[PDB]
Amino acid sequence: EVKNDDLELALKKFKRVSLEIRRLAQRHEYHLRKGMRLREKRKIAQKKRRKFR
């Protein structure tokens, strides 16, 4: 995730890199069933459908 030129325009983009790293890593630190894995994956997929379109 290397990107930086002078001071801050890369830092403003660092926030986006981290948030998504945090979201993806947060589901590899607690264990739950595969069925729940798929259920929460589909629930998250509905969320993108509601706002990002």
Partner 1 sequence: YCRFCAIGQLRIDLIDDLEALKRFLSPYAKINPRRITGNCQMHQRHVAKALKRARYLALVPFVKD
Partner RNA sequence: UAUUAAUCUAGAGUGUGGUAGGGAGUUUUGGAAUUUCAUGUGGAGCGGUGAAAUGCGUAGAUAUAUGAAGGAACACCAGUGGCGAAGGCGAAAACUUAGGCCAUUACUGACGCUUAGGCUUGAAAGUGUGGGGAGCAAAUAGGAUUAGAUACCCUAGUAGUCCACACCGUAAACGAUAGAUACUAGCUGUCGGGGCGAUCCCCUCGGUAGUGAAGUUAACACAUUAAGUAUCUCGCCUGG
Length of the chain, in residues: 53
Smallest distance from the beta carbon of 11 to RNA, in angstroms? 21
* Token pair 């990107």: residue: 3
Which parts of 1-53 interact with RNA (CB under 7 A)?
24, 31, 34, 41-42, 44-46, 48-49
Residues 1-40 that bind partner 1 (CB under 8 A): 1-2
Gap between the Cα atoms of 7 and 13, Å rounded: 12
Enter the tokens of residue 30: 């607690």
State the residue for tokens 């993108």.
48
Q: How far is the CB of 15 from RNA (least distance, A)?
A: 19
| List of residues contacting partner 1 (CB under 8 A) | 1-2, 52
